[PDB]
Amino acid sequence: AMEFQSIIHLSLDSPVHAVCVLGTEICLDLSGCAPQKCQCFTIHGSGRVLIDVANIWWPLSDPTYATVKMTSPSPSVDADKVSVTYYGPVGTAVLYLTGIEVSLEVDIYRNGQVEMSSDKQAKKKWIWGPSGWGAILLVNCNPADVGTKKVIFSEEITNLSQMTLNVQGPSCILKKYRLVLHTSKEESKKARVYWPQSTFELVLGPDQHAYTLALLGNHLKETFYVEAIAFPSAEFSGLISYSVSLVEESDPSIPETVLYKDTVVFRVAPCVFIPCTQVPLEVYLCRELQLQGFVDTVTKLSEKSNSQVASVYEDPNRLGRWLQDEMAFCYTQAPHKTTSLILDTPQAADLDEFPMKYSLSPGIGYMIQDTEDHKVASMDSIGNLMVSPPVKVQGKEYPLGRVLIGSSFYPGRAMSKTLRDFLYAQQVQAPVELYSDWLMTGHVDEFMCFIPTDKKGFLLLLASPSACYKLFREKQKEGYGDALLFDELRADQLLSNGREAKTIDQLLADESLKKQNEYVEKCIHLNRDILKTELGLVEQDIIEIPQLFCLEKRSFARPYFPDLLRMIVMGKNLGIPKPFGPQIKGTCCLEEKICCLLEPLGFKCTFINDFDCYLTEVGDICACANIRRVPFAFKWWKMVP
Amino acid sequence: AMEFQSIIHLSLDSPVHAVCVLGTEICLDLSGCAPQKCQCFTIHGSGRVLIDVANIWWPLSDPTYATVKMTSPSPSVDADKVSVTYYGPVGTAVLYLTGIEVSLEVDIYRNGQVEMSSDKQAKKKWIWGPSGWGAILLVNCNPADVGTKKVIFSEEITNLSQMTLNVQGPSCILKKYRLVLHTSKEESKKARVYWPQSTFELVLGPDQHAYTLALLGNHLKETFYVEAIAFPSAEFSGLISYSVSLVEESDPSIPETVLYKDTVVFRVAPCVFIPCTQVPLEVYLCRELQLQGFVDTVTKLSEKSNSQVASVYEDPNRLGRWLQDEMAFCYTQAPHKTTSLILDTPQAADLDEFPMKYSLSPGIGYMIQDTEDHKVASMDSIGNLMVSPPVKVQGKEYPLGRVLIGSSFYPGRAMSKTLRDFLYAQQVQAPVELYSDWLMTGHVDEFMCFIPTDKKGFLLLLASPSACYKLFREKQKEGYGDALLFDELRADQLLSNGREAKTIDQLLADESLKKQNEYVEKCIHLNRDILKTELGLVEQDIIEIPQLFCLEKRSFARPYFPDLLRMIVMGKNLGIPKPFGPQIKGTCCLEEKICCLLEPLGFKCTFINDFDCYLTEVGDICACANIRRVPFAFKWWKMVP
Ligand SMILES: [Cl-]
Ligand SMILES: [Cl-]
């Protein structure tokens, strides 16, 4: 008999000639051919064979099976043997073996190189955690792709994951078969596989899910380079598997058959967002022909903070403040490479040009993410997200922090199912839903800010209208009720921005303003509870920041004076919006209050003088920034979501 | 001051009057108002207040917080109090409390009744396993729905899950608020909530995701009845949450605000498929005007097995064998109720009538599942599924077995992404992909069958052409080479079914038939390996069944003689297709062989005489059956997928 299978029925008469793929086990039926007078048996194998008898003689039970496996490939056909000798009160059975290797290997232990997997079945599984395993694939974020044969540079080839195919066996056995490297039609739309000729040929991708390789000689060693196309999403878990099938070429009436298949599994790394507690590397600035105020002060602050400034062009096809509202700096990481990128959720239709590519420093990626709602003040954009610092909550670690999404509480505007599903599909920053649709912009950054400390490693700052009323009341009692909110601002600057200079006395007697702020205070308190619960915070982690709001067009909250919470956080250097509060002998009481709260904790407060920038209405153009920061040192794959 | 929040800043001057929702905690800032001369303090609360000072006097630290909570609702406003007395080398601060209850409760401990949850935050989580928690919801499978105010019978109301809402507090506090029972727009499409007036009003559902309730008096107690619409799928995880928001009615210029929200989570039970090792309860039979053969023998076998027979009408709008190929008996289970149902994946377009409803015994549900591919021999149907018995594999338990799906191995036909995703979304029967597209029907039941034993509790039978060649060779050597395959069958019965009577000598000399069977044997061996690996089977669990195949129109395998593996499994009673093998002195050697293999294990073999039924071509009409069985005793929620 001639065979390629997991079960072999030995025959006293004809010895079996079989193929053994290395890493697999064959079950040997020893008793089916045994003579009736046989009571016991002995079994012996050659050097490359490992025989297991239920883990020397053995009693002959009703079923008697032995398992065999091979340790190295055969240098010729039938070079290995297993012999069974039947003892009674009488027969021999023989199996000739030829061992071949057919294996696909990846960086399964996440060490930065392809390593041989210890087990053919364990290698199809992807296990999270430090005691886990499973290779990682990175999405191609090359900004050129935004809007068959390719040249790939040594700088770009490190982004790709290796997948090695090894086949070893006698030439006369291997020539009977063909190899097919493949994946399912659906998985092929999610990644590309390249083969170097440097010049690389596309062997698998969205239009090709099977690739044939000829077996010429006694060994084939080929390395393929793989890249993902998309991050995990509602429709995509992140898992992609590749297989090599050994196909027996046929007689035209009998179809071909697959005799063996080896499979590897990749997990496409998630898109990870970065909180403002991470060290700034670069500050991207969309100036919109501005210099004095925001642009100059933020340029100065950035130099003071060991950070680069990258100019950003205006995009005439987008609403103003797009650099902040439609984009986020994030990263994606593999054992062999970390790719920082900007994730863009454009609100405009049919875009042709992408001016943000001029600013992107070498190696910085660019990815687009679709959304559904594109109106002014839409919360369906990546700007409607804030990242917490790393926290432990109820004994559960969130080493990369948790993503915070602005949402609604009235049973209004919201993030689309598409963008929300994309976020939850990343897994490693378990999203928390906050309440922000009471704010005109819908952005939580108008009432909260995390700042790093040199303990949890951070403090949460929260907007507090009650704290501001308390501060103004104390000043009034001290005889400063005549001090003026919006002092040192030009009358037309106030009028053109919907504001009016008011004394502390007029502000404290304004019952409508007080009711607007009481409403805002209730909305912030709802969020304070969710943040304490979901981030494991205690009140010692929170600092109240005096901040007034007003309701504009139900109506929505807007900062009354420039929002102190809208900080540019650069380590210990804080770029705080200059609020223009009531002055008490040449000093703004709001600047003095916030400096008294933050300076003793090691913070350097720089007040950004730019009233028009901070009072810009939603949709209107203004200078803005987006800071690119150091990715977390904690490796995402070692987390157990 | 007047408040409803998680943080209260005490004031030496004005005492605070606050609302405390039961089950929540308030943080009290004790140090912010403390006099400069104060060095230590004492705190005292009344009977309903629980005070925690970092878990009698206490030192006055820079931040000094105390947490308070309430144990029962207040019978009047300010009926509870907390007093802080400041000691120096000097002041008092007071908080008046009013406790209210606002809670949604479900059968969170899966005990069959609504129980009070121990924690407001833990109740939003759904944890798998015996030490888990989380209420369960059942899909409405009423066959009437196949194709605002409702009457629900005491028999049908047990299918629904209870959700109780309790609100308790002073009438003068509760009258300030409104209650809103709600869920997101997307979740509302997945379930219906009813309120009894018995006659039940639909309060939440696909067209209504918010329902308002008036707070009249000092307490509200309402029970709602919930039912799911759909099983988990590609787009639906199975989790649905409901909330009650306490809304403060507004001054028209200030929008309303939500002061508190309580939330419960349900998991819609998965659709669980049943293996043929479970005890038969009812046999559904589509006779198609037939009596002698299949219909009579299966009716007899069913009576012999303590099972009911339910006649099924012919469906002229569907391909033949639809009762078996387009339907599956499955179940869905909650702590309070188990619903057995038939899951239908119709292959026809625009169906109006559903004759299977006439057969459905009282209480048996009916659900439809969409598919994409509707051609003849399509593997995109629920008939392309077999369920394994419960198994343990590599230390992992599959107490409900694993679903087995027929698929392809040539890198052909396949299950659609829609049906496959529906199956994997159930979670509790971790699907295994087998190779069956080499078979004309694409059904794994043509080469494998599980039978229960009175140890794993089962045996796997596998089709084996090699075993059949071996049996025929032994008969030839004994002088019976003249024995005839298809003996005792009429010549026209053979001709009209594409077969011809052949002696054992002619069969063993047929080289084309041998090559067709060698091909089939390689395909079955691929599946034997996957089954051993994925189900943790050893060769002692497998019995080879002699069975020949032939290739017909690449070409596809069909059973050559009636397929012995296509058994009607009724406990120890097996309805085996009568194969009409070569007879050796009045006995079919195939019947004798299978009886020698199965009878010593306690099986009673009944050979179903019906050649035309077992040789029916795909798409053609024939009598067939579908057996409804006992659901597993193991509760699905106690598994950790
Ligand atoms: Cl996953
Ligand atoms: Cl889930």
Numbering used by the authors:
A (entry chain A), B (entry chain A): 8 to 62, 73 to 106, 112 to 169, 177 to 226, 231 to 283, 285 to 445, 449 to 491, 497 to 595, ...
Please give me the paper's original passages concerning this structure.
The human peptidylarginine deiminase type VI (PAD6) is essential in oocyte and embryonic development as a component of the supramolecular assemblies called cytoplasmic lattices. PAD6 is the most recently characterized member of the PAD family and is specifically expressed in oocytes. It was found to play a significant role in oocyte maturation and the development of the fertilized oocyte beyond the two-cell stage. The crystal structure presented here suggests PAD6 assembles as a dimer resembling other PADs, albeit with compromised abilities to bind Ca2+ and substrates.
In order to understand the impact of these post-translational modifications on its activity, we designed two phospho­mimetic mutations, S10E and S446E, and included them in our final construct. The tertiary structure of PAD6 is typical of the PAD family and consists of two consecutive immunoglobulin-like domains (IgG1 and IgG2) followed by a α/β propeller C-terminal domain. The crystal structures of PAD2 and PAD3 exhibit the same head-to-tail assembly. Examination of the PAD6 crystal packing showed that PAD6 adopts a nearly identical dimeric arrangement across the crystal packing, with a buried surface of 1986.5 Å2 at the interface [Fig. S3(a)]. PAD1–3 bind calcium at equivalent sites to PAD4 except PAD1, which lacks the binding site for Ca5. The sequence examination shows that many of the acidic (seven Asp or Glu) and polar (one Asn) residues involved in the Ca2+ coordination in PAD4 are not conserved in PAD6 [Fig. 3(a)]. However, Ala676 is flanked by two cysteines (Cys675 and Cys677) that could potentially act as active residues. In the structure, neither Cys675 nor Cys677 are favourably positioned and oriented for effective reactivity with the substrate in PAD6, and the I661–A678 loop occludes access to either of these cysteines [Figs. 4(b) and 4(c)]. Additionally, in this structure, Arg347 shields access to the catalytic centre formed by Asp351, His471 and Asp473 by occupying the substrate-binding cleft. In PAD6, the residue corresponding to Arg347 of PAD2, Arg355, adopts a similar position in the vicinity of Asp353, His480 and Asp482 [Fig. 4(e)]. The activation of PAD6 would involve the displacement of the loop I661–A678 so that the substrate could access the active centre. In our structure, a PEG molecule from the crystallization solution was found in the vicinity of Cys675 and Cys677 [Fig. S5(c)], suggesting that this conformation is not rigid, and the putative active site can be accessed by a potential substrate.
